[PDB]
Design a protein around this nucleic acid. Structure first.
Ligand SMILES: [Mg+2]
Ligand SMILES: [Mg+2]
Ligand SMILES: [Mg+2]
Ligand SMILES: [Mg+2]
Ligand SMILES: [Mg+2]
Ligand SMILES: [Mg+2]
Ligand SMILES: [Mg+2]
Ligand SMILES: [Mg+2]
Ligand SMILES: [Mg+2]
Ligand SMILES: [Mg+2]
Ligand SMILES: [Mg+2]
Ligand SMILES: [Mg+2]
Ligand SMILES: [Mg+2]
Ligand SMILES: [Mg+2]
Ligand SMILES: [Mg+2]
Ligand SMILES: [Mg+2]
Ligand SMILES: [Mg+2]
Ligand SMILES: [Mg+2]
Ligand SMILES: [Mg+2]
Ligand SMILES: [Mg+2]
Ligand SMILES: [Mg+2]
Ligand SMILES: [Mg+2]
Ligand SMILES: [Mg+2]
Ligand SMILES: [Mg+2]
Ligand SMILES: [Mg+2]
Ligand SMILES: [Mg+2]
Ligand SMILES: [Mg+2]
Ligand SMILES: [Mg+2]
Ligand SMILES: [Mg+2]
Ligand SMILES: [Mg+2]
Ligand SMILES: [Mg+2]
Ligand SMILES: [Mg+2]
Ligand SMILES: [Mg+2]
Ligand SMILES: [Mg+2]
Ligand SMILES: [Mg+2]
Ligand SMILES: [Mg+2]
Ligand SMILES: [Mg+2]
Ligand SMILES: [Mg+2]
Ligand SMILES: [Mg+2]
Ligand SMILES: [Zn+2]
Lengths: 138, 124, 99, 208, 150
RNA sequence: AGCUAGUUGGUGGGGUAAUGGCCCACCAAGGCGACGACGGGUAGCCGGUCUGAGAGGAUGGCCGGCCACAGGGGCACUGA
RNA sequence: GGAGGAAGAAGCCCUUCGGGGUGUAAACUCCUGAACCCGGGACGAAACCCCCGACGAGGGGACUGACGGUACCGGGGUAAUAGCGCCGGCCAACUCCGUGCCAGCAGCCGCGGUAAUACGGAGGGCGCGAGCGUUACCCGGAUUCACUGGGCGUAAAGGGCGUGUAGGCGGCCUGGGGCGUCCCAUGUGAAAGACCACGGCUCAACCGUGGGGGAGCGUGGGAUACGCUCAGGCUAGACG
RNA sequence: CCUGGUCCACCCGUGACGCUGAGGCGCGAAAGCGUGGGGAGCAAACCGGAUUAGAUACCCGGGUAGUCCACGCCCUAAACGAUGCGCGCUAGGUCUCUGGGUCUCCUGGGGGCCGAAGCUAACGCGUUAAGCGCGCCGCCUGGGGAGUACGGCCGCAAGGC
RNA sequence: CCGAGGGUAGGGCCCGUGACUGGGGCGAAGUCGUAACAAGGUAGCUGUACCGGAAGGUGCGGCUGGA
């Protein structure tokens, strides 16, 4: 019945990329779009549009991957090598502003819901706020 | 374990057993000799280790190893006990601090002598 | 300020007093997860106007008796036995954990 | 304290050469020029590869036997540096060098450090007026390391004050040989220092 | 032709009617100290030989260790086998703190400021293979947003 | 693993510098507990101190703040 | 104690009987002078108190030092204590002789059975130095109680299987409150310690000043994504 | 005859009413126990016969409880997939059981083998996961001592937790 | 009246200790056998029951970690 649709979403993606794939379709959500908006806007995907599979709203999310490689196992590098959720439904993980993590030395992103919209490690540090550290992506 | 589970059960501290009860966790302990025998070694070794059962001040009683070569310890002598087992003589778990009270330092030894308690000699 | 609390009257069986069960929550000091945890306070009611099932604000008051350092501030919403049941069931569950 | 014993013997062992002595180490007889092999009954034998540990030991030992300082103080300093901000590699030396009994060695006043020591401790040296018998006394930036009135007149301060006329000295130092009174310009920069020692390896030996 | 310094060597053995034949193993690291290194494992009927092969293989398999001040771009963790390895960059002037294997490797890779830590199985061989695949996975802000084009 | 007779509450009194079952008469039958009541064991508590990459772990001698006791126990007098 | 000093004394230890070692170490030669010897010798102490003014604000005058003739200053001045730990591996430091599963070593793996770098003595070497070793306890290594940060097919670890109480956990949309949560302001968070600077005693240890931080918790204000709560709706879970 | 679960089809109804689950409660192979029936075959025990240095055994001839039924206990196990349950997600191939369709084909549940990716110490796992994730319960923390002791609770006992 | 405590009586927990008894650990080279590991020379293990100097045997059902 899904408990955290988000960790799901993210997993949907983690699994998607593993074999590389046009897109994958998380079921729609005004928060999942939100989260997704920051993947594309930060360049982890091509993007997403609404769709449907018989009355049921989803999100076609078009992935992104690296350039074909040489040598054995010529599968591309991954645009998203790692995406694991922080705050979980069984342990909400909140953070003040000075506590906010520094993913991978700026190379990654700490998406995180806040009192003024879904920001990120840099975005929130600027606006000077905090909130439920949603997850770390790189 | 889940997080909720830790909120219930929670992790359990180890707490370790005192390899030696020299009592009061004191540095050393004094005691009088009850018997002064000579026991034999364990698995692959062979010898005649010089040992003593000591009657501590703590109404206890324990066997104890006697360092060095040759000693001077009798059924009524007064020893100070140190503590370190002997990976060879099941039973012995304390050492005799040489050259203190009725315990005489090692005779004619010259090498490492903090251990073995013999005084530094003169060359002449 | 005179510390105020909010909770459910779970017992009306005293003369001029009610037991107000009081829930509260916080982040676990090592394991994060927020955790509910409650306490019962005995509250003065010099008019016995408060009945079994009310939610109420209580206020740190000067000692009325032993065990009793709170007056019932004001009502917050009558008729809420659902929470009282939550309490009573718990209480009743006990019988089955002895010998 | 300050070692005190056979020394053209660690001039040895450390392989690399040092001048605990001063003059004689220049001779064609530092014993180093004569026996390239570390001391003891063995010495000249097929020397087995040093276990990583050994390496880091010999290094730090080298660097220490140079200023012939106490393991404690060396360490003290090390930690002191480690605490203070900056690349501990250099800064450890900076202070290792600021040691009076060393700042007085680099300003010609003496030939060996073991001589430069007995110099400071015997009050023969002095600073901005007041004399100092404190080998450990760390010199800051902008200080006058003169000699003393009762000391200007020594056959030994002189003979070392002698060949020193003209000879050049570290960039962080300035000597008015006439008035036999040297200054300390600044805290040295790594290069300014030339020693046979990879500071890195020391810093590592203490991460044991 | 590079630095070439060998990690560990071991004698192994196999049984056969009449006693125990042997063999020797050599793990070797290779580097110029600019950001080039390679790991090489070589077994053979004798010490000298084995070590040789070690070097040969070492060169065959080398990785572009992309420094950024004599240190490292980002912090990484990698499990190969039962062996986990942590790599954290230090500010200039620190030292390369690690155990034989990880250190060894990292010196010739030309690092100078790195925090490490072996976890799990501290089997040299597998810590080796471990570290490589860590370095082999190093990215700079460049090659990063180089993939976030679109 | 069940606890409880001043026990929980109430009216009226006594007591104090003052609240209060602190104490006393009477009335109601209550109070507490797996969020660990009751019981057993061990311990003065903190600012700190030690160690550790840190989160933690251990610790509370010197110095500073509070508590407690003055051979064991009980009581009150004087008095701000 | 410092500077010089042999292709290098003796003694002593190895020796493939040529030699190698301690070792510039010593002797030996010069120069400095810990101690001790003589003289000088405080800061800590300006108030209280007396006079004028008013017994006040302001001005002046005098008494008082336990440590103590000690610190510190000036002169003279003698070469003037070294010790303990270890050297099989971890872990740095190697060879003779004795010994012969004996005597003994030992934190672990182990050593000693007639050639022992592992016992005991020696020569040498490493290490630290007014110390060095040992025993006892705390933390660390121990990612071996794991929040950071582990696990359960066969290594230790899935309850023999259900039903269900409390509890934990909660799908899509809309709004109200703002309890969690986030921000700002302010009170509090003594001093001492710590930590960054600066000086005070010859440095240092100790010590002063100044600054900077401290989670928490109270108070006021604000935000409303996520969690919570109240309310209205949906059909993808669930049920019929 | 009485009754449970379970899958399919139609998209009709309610509109999150869900998942898990400390304790509790129920069920729980064989053997074993109580009361009362039942007894052919088999068969602990036990008796014989061989074998054997011996043979309290293996092989042979007998044979009692038991094995069966009714009611009540006991509550253990290699109670084994040695794999807790629920949900989402990540190639296919092959045969097999059983539904449904404008049926050489598609689709839905179930049971097997080979296997992408990925996991794994390895063996192996692999849409019936040991993959990748969330929820909740149980459990492990070196071997022997020892599932022993003591206490407690349950049991008629054996013994169980 | 209350009251330190003292007295009588009866319970609860904990430590020590005791003729004797039970098993358990360790012990360079003891006695009796051979149970297990290879079809272990009767596949093994297993819960239970009965039995036997001892490992063990057998009965019933189970597991393959056997064939
Ligand atoms: Mg032996
Ligand atoms: Mg692993
Ligand atoms: Mg009372
Ligand atoms: Mg006490
Ligand atoms: Mg740590
Ligand atoms: Mg008293
Ligand atoms: Mg060595
Ligand atoms: Mg020894
Ligand atoms: Mg020896
Ligand atoms: Mg370490
Ligand atoms: Mg720990
Ligand atoms: Mg965890
Ligand atoms: Mg583990
Ligand atoms: Mg197991
Ligand atoms: Mg199961
Ligand atoms: Mg089991
Ligand atoms: Mg429920
Ligand atoms: Mg403070
Ligand atoms: Mg409707
Ligand atoms: Mg259920
Ligand atoms: Mg049966
Ligand atoms: Mg029967
Ligand atoms: Mg038969
Ligand atoms: Mg028959
Ligand atoms: Mg049964
Ligand atoms: Mg089966
Ligand atoms: Mg199927
Ligand atoms: Mg398969
Ligand atoms: Mg399939
Ligand atoms: Mg044990
Ligand atoms: Mg057991
Ligand atoms: Mg049992
Ligand atoms: Mg019992
Ligand atoms: Mg009494
Ligand atoms: Mg058998
Ligand atoms: Mg057999
Ligand atoms: Mg058999
Ligand atoms: Mg059986
Ligand atoms: Mg039989
Ligand atoms: Zn020299």
């Amino acid at each position: 019945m899904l408990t955290d649709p988000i960790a799901d979403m993210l997993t949907r993606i983690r699994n998607a990329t593993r074999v590389y794939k046009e897109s994958t379709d998380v079921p729609a959500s005004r928060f999942k779009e939100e989260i997704l908006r920051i993947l594309a806007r930060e360049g982890f995907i091509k993007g997403y549009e609404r769709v449907d599979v018989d009355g049921k709203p989803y999100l076609r999310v078009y992935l992104k991957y690296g350039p074909r490689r040489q040598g054995p196992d010529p599968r591309p590098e991954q645009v998203i090598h790692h995406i694991r959720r922080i705050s979980k439904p069984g342990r909400r993980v909140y953070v003040g502003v000075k506590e906010i993590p520094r993913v991978r030395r700026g190379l990654g992103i700490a998406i995180l819901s806040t009192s003024k919209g879904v920001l990120t490690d840099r975005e929130a540090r600027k606006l000077g706020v905090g909130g439920e550290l949603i997850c770390e992506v790189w | 374990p889940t997080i909720n589970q830790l909120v219930r059960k929670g992790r359990e501290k180890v707490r370790k057993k005192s390899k030696v009860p020299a009592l009061k966790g004191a540095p050393f302990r004094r005691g009088v000799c009850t018997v002064v025998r000579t026991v034999t070694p364990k698995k692959p070794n062979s010898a005649l280790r010089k040992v003593a059962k000591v009657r501590l001040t703590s109404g206890y009683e324990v066997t104890a190893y006697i360092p060095g070569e040759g000693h001077n310890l009798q059924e009524h002598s007064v020893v100070l006990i140190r503590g370190g087992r002997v990976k060879d003589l099941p039973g012995v778990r304390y050492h005799i601090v040489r050259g203190v009270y009725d315990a005489a330092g090692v005779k004619d030894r010259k090498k490492s002598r903090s251990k073995y308690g013999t005084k530094k000699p003169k060359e002449a | 300020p005179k510390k105020v609390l909010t909770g459910v009257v779970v017992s009306d069986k005293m003369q001029k007093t009610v037991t107000v069960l009081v829930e509260r929550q916080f982040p676990h000091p090592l394991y994060g997860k927020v955790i509910k945890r409650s306490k019962k306070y005995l509250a003065h009611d010099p008019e016995e106007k408060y009945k079994l099932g009310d939610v109420v604000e209580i206020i740190e008051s000067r000692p009325i008796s032993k065990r009793k350092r709170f007056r019932v501030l004001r009502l917050v919403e009558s008729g809420r036995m659902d929470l009282v049941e939550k309490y009573l069931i718990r209480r009743q569950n006990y019988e089955s954990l002895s010998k | 304290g300050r070692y005190i014993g056979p020394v053209c013997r660690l001039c040895r062992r450390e392989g690399v050469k040092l001048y605990l002595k001063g003059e004689r180490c220049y001779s064609p007889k530092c014993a180093m020029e004569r026996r390239p092999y570390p001391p003891g009954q063995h010495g000249q034998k097929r020397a087995r590869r040093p276990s990583d540990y050994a390496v880091r030991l010999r290094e730090k030992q080298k660097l220490r036997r140079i200023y012939g300082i106490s393991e404690r103080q060396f360490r003290n300093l090390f930690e002191e540096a480690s605490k203070k901000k900056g690349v501990t590699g250099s800064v450890f030396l900076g202070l290792l060098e600021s040691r009076l009994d060393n700042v007085v060695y680099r300003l010609g006043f003496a030939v060996s450090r073991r001589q430069a020591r007995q110099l400071v401790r015997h009050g023969h040296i002095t600073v901005n007026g007041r004399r100092v018998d404190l080998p450990s006394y760390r010199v800051r930036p902008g200080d006058e390391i003169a000699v003393a009135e009762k000391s200007r007149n020594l056959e030994l301060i002189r003979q070392n004050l002698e060949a020193m006329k003209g000879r050049k000295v570290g960039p962080w130092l300035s000597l008015d040989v006439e008035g036999m009174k040297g200054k300390f310009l600044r805290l040295p920069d790594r290069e300014d220092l030339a020693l046979p020692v990879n500071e890195q390896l020391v810093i590592e030996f203490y991460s044991r | 032709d590079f630095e070439e310094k060998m990690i560990l060597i071991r004698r192994t053995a196999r049984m056969q009617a009449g006693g125990r034949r042997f063999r020797f193993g050599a793990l070797v690291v290779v580097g110029d100290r600019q950001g080039r290194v390679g790991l090489g494992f070589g077994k053979a009927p004798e010490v000298p030989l084995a070590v040789q092969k070690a070097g040969y293989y070492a060169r065959r398999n080398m990785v572009e260790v992309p420094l950024q001040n004599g240190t490292i771009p980002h912090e990484i963790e990698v499990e190969f086998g039962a062996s986990k390895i942590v790599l954290k960059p230090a500010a200039p002037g620190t030292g390369v703190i690690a155990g034989a294997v990880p250190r060894a490797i990292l010196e010739l890779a030309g690092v100078t400021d790195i925090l490490t830590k072996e976890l799990g199985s501290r089997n040299p061989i597998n810590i080796a293979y471990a570290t490589m695949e860590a370095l082999r996975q190093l990215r700079t802000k460049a090659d990063v947003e180089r993939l976030r084009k679109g």
